[PDB]
Coordinates of C-alpha atoms and ligand atoms in Angstrom, one line a residue:
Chain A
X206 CA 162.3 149.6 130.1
X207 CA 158.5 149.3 130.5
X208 CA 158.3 147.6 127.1
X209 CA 159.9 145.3 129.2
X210 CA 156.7 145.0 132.1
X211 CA 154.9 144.5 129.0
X212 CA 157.1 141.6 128.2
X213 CA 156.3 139.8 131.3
X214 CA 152.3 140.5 131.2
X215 CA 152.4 138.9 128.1
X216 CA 154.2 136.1 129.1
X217 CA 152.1 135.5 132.1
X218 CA 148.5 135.8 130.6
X219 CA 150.5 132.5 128.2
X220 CA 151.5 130.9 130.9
X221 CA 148.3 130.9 132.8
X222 CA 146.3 129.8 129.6
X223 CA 149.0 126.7 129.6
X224 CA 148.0 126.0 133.2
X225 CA 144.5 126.1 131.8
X226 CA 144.6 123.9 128.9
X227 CA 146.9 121.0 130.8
X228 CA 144.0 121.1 133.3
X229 CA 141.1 120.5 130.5
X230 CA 143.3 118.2 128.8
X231 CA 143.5 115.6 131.9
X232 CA 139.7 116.2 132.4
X233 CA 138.9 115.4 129.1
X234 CA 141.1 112.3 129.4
X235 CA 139.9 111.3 132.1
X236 CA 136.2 111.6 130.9
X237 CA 137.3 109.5 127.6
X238 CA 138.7 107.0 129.8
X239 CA 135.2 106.6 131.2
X240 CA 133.2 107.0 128.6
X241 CA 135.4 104.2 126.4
X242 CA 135.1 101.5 128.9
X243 CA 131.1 102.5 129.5
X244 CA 131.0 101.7 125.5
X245 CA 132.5 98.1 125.8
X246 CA 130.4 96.7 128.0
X247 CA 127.5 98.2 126.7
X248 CA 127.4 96.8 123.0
X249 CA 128.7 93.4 121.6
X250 CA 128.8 94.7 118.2
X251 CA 131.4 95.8 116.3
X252 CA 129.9 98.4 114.3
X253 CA 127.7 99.5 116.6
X254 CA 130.4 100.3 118.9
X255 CA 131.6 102.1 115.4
X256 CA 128.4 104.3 115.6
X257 CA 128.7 104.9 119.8
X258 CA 132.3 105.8 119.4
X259 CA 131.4 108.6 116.7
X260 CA 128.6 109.5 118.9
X261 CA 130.4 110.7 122.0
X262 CA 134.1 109.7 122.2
X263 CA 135.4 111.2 118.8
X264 CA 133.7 114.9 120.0
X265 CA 135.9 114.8 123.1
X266 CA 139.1 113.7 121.1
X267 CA 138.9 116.6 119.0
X268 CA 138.2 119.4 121.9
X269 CA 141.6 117.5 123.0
X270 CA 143.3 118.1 119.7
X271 CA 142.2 121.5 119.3
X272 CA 143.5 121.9 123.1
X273 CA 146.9 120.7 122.1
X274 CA 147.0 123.3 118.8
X275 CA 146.5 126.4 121.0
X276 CA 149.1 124.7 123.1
X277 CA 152.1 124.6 120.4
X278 CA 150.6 128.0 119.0
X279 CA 151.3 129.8 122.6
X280 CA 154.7 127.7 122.6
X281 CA 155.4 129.7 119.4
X282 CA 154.5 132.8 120.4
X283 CA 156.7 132.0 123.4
X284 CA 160.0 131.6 121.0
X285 CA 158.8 134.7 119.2
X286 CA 158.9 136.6 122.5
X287 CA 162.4 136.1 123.8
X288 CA 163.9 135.6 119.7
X289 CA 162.8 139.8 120.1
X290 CA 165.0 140.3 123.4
X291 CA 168.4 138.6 121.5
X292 CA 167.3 141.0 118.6
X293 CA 167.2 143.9 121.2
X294 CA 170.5 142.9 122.7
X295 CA 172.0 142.6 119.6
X296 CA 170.9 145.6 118.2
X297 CA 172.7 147.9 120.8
X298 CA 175.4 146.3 120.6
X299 CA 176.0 147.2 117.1
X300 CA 174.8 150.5 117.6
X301 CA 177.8 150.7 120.3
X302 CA 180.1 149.7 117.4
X303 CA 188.6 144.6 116.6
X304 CA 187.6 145.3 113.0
X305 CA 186.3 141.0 112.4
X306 CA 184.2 140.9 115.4
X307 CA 181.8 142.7 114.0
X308 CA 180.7 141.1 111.0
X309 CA 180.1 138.2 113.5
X310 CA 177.8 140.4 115.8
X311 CA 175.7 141.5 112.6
X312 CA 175.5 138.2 111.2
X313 CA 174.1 136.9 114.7
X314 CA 171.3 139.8 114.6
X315 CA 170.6 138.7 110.9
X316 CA 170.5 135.0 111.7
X317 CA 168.0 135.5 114.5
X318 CA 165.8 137.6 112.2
X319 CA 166.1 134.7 110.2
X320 CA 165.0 132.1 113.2
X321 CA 161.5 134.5 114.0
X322 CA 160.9 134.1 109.7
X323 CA 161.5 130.3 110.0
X324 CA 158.7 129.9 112.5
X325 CA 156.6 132.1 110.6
X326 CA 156.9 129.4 107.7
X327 CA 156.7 126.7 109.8
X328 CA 153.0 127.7 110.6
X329 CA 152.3 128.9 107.0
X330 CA 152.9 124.9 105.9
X331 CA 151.5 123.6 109.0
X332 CA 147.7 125.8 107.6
X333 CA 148.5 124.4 104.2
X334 CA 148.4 120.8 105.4
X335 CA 145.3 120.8 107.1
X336 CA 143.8 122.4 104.3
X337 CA 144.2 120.2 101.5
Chain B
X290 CA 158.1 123.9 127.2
X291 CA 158.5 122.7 123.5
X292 CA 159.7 124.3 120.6
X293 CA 157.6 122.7 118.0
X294 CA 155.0 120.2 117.4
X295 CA 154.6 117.4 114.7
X296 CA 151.9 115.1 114.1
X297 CA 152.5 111.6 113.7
X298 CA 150.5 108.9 112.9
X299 CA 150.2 104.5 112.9
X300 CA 148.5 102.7 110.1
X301 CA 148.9 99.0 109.8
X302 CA 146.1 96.2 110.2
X303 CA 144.4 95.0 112.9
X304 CA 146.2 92.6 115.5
X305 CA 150.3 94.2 113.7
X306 CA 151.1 95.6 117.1
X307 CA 150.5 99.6 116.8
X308 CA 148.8 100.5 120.4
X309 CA 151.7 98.3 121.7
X310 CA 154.6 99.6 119.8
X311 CA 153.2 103.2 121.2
X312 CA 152.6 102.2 124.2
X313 CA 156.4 100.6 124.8
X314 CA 157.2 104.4 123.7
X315 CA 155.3 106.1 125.4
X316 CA 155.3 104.7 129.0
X317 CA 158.2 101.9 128.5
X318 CA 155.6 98.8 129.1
X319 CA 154.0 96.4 127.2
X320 CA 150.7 94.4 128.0
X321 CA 149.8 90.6 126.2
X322 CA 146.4 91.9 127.2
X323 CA 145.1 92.6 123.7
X324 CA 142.4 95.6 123.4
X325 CA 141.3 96.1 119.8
X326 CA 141.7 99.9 119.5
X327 CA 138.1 101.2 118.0
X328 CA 138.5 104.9 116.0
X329 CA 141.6 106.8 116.7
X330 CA 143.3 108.5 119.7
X331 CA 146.7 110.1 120.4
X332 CA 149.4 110.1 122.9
X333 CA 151.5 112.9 123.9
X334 CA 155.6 112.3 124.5
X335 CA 158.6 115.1 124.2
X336 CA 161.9 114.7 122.9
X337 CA 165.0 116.5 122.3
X338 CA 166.9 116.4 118.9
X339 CA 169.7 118.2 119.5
X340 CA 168.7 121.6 120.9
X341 CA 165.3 121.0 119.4
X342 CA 162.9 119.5 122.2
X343 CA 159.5 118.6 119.8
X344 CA 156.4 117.3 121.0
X345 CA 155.1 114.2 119.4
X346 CA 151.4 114.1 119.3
X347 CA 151.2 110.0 118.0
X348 CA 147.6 109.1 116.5
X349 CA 146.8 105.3 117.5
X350 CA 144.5 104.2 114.7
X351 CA 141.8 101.3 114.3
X352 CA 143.6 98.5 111.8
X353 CA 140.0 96.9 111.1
X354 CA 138.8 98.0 107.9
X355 CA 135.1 99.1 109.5
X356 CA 137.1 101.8 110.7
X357 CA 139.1 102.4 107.6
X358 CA 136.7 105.9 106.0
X359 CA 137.4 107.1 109.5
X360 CA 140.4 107.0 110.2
X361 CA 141.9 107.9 106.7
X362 CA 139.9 111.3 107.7
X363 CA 143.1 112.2 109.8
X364 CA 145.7 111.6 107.1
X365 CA 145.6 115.2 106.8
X366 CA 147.8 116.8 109.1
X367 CA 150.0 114.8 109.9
X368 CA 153.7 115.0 109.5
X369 CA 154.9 111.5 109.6
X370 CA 153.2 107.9 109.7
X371 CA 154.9 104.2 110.2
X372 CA 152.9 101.5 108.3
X373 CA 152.9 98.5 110.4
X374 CA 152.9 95.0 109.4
X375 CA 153.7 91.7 111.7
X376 CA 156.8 89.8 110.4
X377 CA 154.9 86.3 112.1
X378 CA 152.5 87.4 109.3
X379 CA 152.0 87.7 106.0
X380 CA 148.6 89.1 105.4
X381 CA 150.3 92.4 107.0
X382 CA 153.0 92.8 105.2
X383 CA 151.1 91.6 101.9
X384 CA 148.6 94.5 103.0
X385 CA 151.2 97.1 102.9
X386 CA 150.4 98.2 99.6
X387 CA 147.3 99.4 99.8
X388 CA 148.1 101.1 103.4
X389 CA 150.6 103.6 101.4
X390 CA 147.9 103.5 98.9
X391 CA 145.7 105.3 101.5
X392 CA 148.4 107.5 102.2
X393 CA 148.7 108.5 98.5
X394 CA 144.5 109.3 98.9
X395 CA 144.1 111.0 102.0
X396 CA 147.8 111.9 103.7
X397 CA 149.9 115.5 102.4
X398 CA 152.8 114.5 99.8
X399 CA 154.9 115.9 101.4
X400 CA 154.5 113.3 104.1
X401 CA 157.3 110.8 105.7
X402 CA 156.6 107.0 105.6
X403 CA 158.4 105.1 108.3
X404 CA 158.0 100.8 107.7
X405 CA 158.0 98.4 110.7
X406 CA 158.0 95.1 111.2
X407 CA 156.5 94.3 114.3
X408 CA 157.3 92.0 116.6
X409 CA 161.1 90.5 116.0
X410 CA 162.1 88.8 119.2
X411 CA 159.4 85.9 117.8
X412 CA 162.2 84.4 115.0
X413 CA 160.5 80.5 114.9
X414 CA 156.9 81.9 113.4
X415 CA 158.8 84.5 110.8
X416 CA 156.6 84.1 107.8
X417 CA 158.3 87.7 106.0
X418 CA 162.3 87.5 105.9
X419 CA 164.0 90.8 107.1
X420 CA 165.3 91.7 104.1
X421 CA 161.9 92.0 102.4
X422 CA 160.4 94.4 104.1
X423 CA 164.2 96.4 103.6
X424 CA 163.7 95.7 99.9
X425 CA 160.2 97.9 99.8
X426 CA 161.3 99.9 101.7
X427 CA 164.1 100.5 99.1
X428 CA 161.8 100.3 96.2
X429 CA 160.1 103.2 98.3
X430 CA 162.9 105.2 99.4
X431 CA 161.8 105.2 102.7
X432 CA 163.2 103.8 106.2
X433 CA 162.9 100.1 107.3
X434 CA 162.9 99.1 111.3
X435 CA 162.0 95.5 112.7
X436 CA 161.0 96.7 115.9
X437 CA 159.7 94.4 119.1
X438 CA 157.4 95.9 121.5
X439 CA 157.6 93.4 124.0
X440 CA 161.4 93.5 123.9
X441 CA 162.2 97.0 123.4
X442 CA 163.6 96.3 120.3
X443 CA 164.8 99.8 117.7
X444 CA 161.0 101.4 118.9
X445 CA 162.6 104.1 120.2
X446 CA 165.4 104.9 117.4
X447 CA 162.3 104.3 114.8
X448 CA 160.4 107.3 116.1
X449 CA 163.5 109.3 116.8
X450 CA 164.6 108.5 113.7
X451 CA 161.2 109.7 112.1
X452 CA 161.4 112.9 114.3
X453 CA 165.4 113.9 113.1
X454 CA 163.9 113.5 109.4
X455 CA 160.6 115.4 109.9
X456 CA 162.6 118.0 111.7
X457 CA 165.6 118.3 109.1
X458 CA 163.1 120.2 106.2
X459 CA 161.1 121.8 108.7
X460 CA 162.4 125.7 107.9
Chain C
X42 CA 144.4 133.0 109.2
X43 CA 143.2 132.5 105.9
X44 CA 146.2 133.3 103.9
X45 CA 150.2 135.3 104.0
X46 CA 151.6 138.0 102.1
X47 CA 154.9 139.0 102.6
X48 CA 155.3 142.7 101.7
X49 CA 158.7 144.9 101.1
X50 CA 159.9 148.4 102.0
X51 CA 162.9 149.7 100.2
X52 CA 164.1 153.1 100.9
X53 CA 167.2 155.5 101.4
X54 CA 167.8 156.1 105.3
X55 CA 165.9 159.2 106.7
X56 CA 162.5 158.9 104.3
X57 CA 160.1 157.5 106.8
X58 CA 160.4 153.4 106.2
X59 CA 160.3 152.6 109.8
X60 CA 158.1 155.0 110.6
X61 CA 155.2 154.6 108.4
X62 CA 155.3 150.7 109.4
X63 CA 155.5 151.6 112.8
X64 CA 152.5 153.4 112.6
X65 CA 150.5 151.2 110.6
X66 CA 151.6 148.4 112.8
X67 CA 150.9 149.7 116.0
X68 CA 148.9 153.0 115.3
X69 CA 152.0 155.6 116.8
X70 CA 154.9 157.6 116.0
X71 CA 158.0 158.9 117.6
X72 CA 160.2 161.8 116.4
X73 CA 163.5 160.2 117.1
X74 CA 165.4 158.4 114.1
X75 CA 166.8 155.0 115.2
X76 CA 168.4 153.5 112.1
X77 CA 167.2 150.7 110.7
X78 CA 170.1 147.3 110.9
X79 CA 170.3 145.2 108.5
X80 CA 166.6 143.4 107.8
X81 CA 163.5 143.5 110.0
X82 CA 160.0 142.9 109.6
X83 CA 156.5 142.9 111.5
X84 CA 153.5 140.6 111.5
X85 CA 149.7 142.4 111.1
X86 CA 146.7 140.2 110.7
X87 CA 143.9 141.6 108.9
X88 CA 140.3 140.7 108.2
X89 CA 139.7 142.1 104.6
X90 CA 137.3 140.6 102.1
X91 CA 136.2 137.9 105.6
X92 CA 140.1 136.1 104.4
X93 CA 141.8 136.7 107.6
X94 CA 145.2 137.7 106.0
X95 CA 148.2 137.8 108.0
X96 CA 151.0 140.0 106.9
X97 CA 154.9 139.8 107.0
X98 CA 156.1 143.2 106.2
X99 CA 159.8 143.4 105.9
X100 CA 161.7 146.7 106.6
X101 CA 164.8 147.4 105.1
X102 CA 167.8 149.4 105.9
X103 CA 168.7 152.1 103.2
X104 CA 171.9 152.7 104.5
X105 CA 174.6 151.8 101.6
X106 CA 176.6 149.3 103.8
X107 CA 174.0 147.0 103.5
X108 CA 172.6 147.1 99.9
X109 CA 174.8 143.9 99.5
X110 CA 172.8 141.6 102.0
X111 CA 168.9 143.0 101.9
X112 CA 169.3 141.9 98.1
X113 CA 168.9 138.7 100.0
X114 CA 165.2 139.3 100.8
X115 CA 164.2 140.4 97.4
X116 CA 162.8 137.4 95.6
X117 CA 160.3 136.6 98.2
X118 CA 158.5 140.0 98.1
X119 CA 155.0 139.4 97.0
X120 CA 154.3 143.2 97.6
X121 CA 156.5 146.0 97.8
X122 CA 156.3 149.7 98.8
X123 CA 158.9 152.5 98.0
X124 CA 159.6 155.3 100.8
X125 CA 159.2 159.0 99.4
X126 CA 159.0 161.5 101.5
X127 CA 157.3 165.0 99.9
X128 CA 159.5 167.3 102.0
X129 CA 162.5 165.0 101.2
X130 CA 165.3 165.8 99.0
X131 CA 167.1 163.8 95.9
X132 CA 165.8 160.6 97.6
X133 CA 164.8 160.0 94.0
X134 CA 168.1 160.2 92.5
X135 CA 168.4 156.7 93.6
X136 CA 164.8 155.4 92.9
X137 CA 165.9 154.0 89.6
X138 CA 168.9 152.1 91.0
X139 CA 166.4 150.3 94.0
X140 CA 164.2 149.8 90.6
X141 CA 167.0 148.1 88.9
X142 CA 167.8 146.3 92.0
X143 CA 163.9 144.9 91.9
X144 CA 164.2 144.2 88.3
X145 CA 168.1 142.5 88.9
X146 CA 166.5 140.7 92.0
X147 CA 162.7 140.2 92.6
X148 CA 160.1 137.7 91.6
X149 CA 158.9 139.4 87.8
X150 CA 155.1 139.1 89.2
X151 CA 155.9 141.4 92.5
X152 CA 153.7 144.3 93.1
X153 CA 155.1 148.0 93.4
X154 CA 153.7 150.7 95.3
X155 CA 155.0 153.8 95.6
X156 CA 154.3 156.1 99.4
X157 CA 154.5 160.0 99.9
X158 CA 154.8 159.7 103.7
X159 CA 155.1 162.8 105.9
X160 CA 152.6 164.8 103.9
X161 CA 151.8 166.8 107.4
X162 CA 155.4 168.6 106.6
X163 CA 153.3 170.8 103.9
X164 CA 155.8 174.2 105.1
X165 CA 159.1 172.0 103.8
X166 CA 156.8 170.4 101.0
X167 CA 159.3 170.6 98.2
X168 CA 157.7 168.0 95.9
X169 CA 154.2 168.5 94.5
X170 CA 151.7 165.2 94.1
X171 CA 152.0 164.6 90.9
X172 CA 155.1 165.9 91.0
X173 CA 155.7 161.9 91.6
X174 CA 152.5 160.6 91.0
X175 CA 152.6 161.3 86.9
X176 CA 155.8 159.2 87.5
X177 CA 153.3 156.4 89.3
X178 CA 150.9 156.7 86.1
X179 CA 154.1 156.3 84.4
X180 CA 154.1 152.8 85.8
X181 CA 150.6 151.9 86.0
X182 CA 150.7 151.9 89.8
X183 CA 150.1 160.4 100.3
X184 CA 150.4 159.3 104.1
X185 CA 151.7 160.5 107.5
X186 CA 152.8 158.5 110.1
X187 CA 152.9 161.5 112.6
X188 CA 149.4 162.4 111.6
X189 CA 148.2 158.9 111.2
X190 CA 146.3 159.6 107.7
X191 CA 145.9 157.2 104.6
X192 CA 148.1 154.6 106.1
X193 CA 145.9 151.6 107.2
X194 CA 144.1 152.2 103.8
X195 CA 147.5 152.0 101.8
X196 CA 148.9 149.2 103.1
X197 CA 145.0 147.3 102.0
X198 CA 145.3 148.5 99.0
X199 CA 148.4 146.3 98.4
X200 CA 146.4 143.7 99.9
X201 CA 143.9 144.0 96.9
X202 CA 146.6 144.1 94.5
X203 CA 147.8 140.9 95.6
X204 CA 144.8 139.4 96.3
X205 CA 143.5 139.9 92.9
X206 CA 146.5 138.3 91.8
X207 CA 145.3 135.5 93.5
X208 CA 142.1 134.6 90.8
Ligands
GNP159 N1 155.6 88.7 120.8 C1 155.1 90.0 120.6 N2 153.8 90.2 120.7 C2 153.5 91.5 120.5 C3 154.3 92.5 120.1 N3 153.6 93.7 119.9 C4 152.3 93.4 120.2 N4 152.2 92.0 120.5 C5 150.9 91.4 120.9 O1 150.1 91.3 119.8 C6 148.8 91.9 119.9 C7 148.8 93.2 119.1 O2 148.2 94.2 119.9 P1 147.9 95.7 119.3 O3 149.0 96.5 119.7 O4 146.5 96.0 119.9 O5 147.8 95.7 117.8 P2 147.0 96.7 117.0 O6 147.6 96.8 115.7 O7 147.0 98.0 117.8 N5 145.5 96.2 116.9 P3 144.3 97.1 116.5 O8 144.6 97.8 115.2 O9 143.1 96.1 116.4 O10 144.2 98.1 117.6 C8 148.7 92.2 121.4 O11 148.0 91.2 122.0 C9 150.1 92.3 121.9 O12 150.2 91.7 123.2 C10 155.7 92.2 119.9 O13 156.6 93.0 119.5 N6 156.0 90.9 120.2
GNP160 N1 156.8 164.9 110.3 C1 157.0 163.6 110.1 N2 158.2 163.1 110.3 C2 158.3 161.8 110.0 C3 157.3 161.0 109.5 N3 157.8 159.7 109.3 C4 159.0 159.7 109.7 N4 159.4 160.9 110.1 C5 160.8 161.2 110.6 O1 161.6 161.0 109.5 C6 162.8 160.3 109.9 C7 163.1 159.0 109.1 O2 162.3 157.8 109.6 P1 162.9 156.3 109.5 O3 161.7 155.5 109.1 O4 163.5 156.0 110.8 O5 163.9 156.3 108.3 P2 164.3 155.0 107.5 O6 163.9 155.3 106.1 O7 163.7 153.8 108.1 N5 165.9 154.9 107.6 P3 166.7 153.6 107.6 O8 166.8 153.1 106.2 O9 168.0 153.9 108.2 O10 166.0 152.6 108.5 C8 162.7 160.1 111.5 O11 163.5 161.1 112.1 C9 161.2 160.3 111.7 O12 161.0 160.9 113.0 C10 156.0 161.5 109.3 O13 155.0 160.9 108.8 N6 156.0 162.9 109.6
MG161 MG1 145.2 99.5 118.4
MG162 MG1 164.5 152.3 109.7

């Protein structure tokens, strides 16, 4: 059991990084705040504000977006980490293998195999959206 | 935690309601104070669809055309969008074409379109019927919601709604 | 990541499947034989030709209870590699019935491999290389796991195959 350490300093480096990226997420909305009000005043225009908003303001909102991606990625990784532990579990218990409960065992180890594949997918058409 | 992530997105023109149907979801208010939105932005809210707890990352969008090039540029990704019209008027809801026309340009195919009629609880200046904006929405196989910011009205079923049918061919 | 292939190891339990994915995957191998359950499978990313490719190799178990349910995972195999072991004996008995099972089952495009793992057991060598390997000219088509040797390079050469496949 010291795969299972390993488990946990896994988990931990993620969950630090999710401390991290919360925290530059508020700062970053709390600098767009800022900066979006400092725009209004300072032009009447409407297209001008156009060309100030792509000049600082659009910048930050992608840093945030790219923020939240690493965020759902770790979340993934996350459900990837303890799908394994139910596929250990269930694993020895049909090595330790009235005759019905079986199958049902099996077919749980099978359809949590299945679960890990479906968020492999999942990302796979999440890469070919953004592509296009 | 979160198990998955979808993008969502509001398109609709300027003045329809978008930042304030969003903002009624998001933090369960609503301001008369009107702010023109200029570019894009997103909120952040969680939800739970049986056993499923999915973060919705909403993109606010500009309705004036100025901002139009831009904010098509985020069509891309995402996994749902509600056009918007106002049912007090008709130059949104006339406009509606060539909104999901811009989602036929720039948005995936595979993408869900959600309708809404903004702001219902305001029945004296109706200029669009209710059962226009279902008949598109027919003609499109898609949903229909009249939603009111201001009173709270089927926002929150709308995106929920959008969510469950996102989330049902997402394997 | 660029792009994902989903590969395929069929095999007859005790010729190496686990093992030479084990040591491709995470560059080790252990003597003791833990049979395979059912279906499994392991992610690798790779960075060949600057396309960051992730892989999705699936391991089956060669075990005949099973050879109802891993037809399951048959049709989605881009890539596939068959488990011979050189010091192994009448594995290849059965080679054409998993080859009618990939002609009864898979995608018609799929790629096919064919893997003499083991090759550090020279002593209990009982099948010669081309022994086999006329059979793999045969179709237009060696590694250890303990030893670590011609793995990594095997497993990108299925990469090419399907890449190629990709222009
Ligand atoms: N009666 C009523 N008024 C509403 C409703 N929703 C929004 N409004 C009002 O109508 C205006 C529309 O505001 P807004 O949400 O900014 O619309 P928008 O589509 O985001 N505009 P823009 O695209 O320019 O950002 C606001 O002044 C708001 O107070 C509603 O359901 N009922
Ligand atoms: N010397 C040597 N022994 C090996 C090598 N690879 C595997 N073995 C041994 O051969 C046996 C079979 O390995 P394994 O992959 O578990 O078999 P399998 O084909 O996956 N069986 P199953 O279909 O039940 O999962 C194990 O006892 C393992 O230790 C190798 O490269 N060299
Ligand atoms: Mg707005
Ligand atoms: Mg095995």
């Amino acid at each position: 059991k010291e795969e299972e350490m390993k488990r946990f300093c896994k988990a931990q480096t993620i969950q630090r990084r999710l401390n991290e990226i919360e925290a530059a997420l508020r700062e970053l909305e709390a600098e767009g705040v800022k900066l979006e009000l400092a725009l209004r005043r300072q032009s009447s225009s409407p297209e001008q504000q156009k060309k100030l908003w792509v000049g600082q303001l659009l910048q930050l909102v992608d840093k945030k977006n790219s923020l939240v991606a690493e965020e759902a990625e770790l979340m993934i990784t996350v459900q990837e980490l303890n799908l394994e532990e139910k596929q250990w579990q269930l694993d020895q218990e049909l090595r330790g293998y009235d005759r019905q409960a079986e199958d049902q065992v099996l077919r749980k180890l099978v359809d949590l195999v299945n679960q890990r594949d479906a968020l492999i997918r999942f990302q796979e058409e999440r890469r070919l959206s953004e592509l296009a | 935690t979160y198990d998955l992530l979808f993008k969502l997105l509001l398109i609709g023109d300027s003045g329809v309601g978008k930042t304030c149907v969003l903002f009624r979801f998001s933090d369960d208010a609503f301001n008369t104070t009107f702010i023109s939105t200029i570019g894009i932005d997103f909120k952040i809210k969680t939800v739970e669809l049986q056993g499923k707890k999915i973060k919705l990352q909403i993109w606010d969008t500009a309705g004036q055309e100025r901002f139009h090039t831009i904010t098509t540029s985020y069509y891309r990704g995402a996994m749902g969008i509600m056009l918007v019209y106002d049912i007090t008027n008709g130059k949104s809801f006339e406009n509606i074409s060539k909104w999901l026309r811009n989602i036929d340009e720039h948005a995936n195919e595979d993408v869900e379109r959600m309708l809404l009629g903004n702001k219902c609880d305001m029945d004296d200046k109706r200029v669009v019927p209710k059962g226009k904006g279902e008949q598109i929405a027919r003609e499109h196989g898609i949903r229909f919601f009249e939603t009111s910011a201001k009173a709270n009205i089927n926002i929150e079923k709308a995106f929920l709604t959008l969510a469950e049918d996102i989330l049902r061919k997402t394997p």
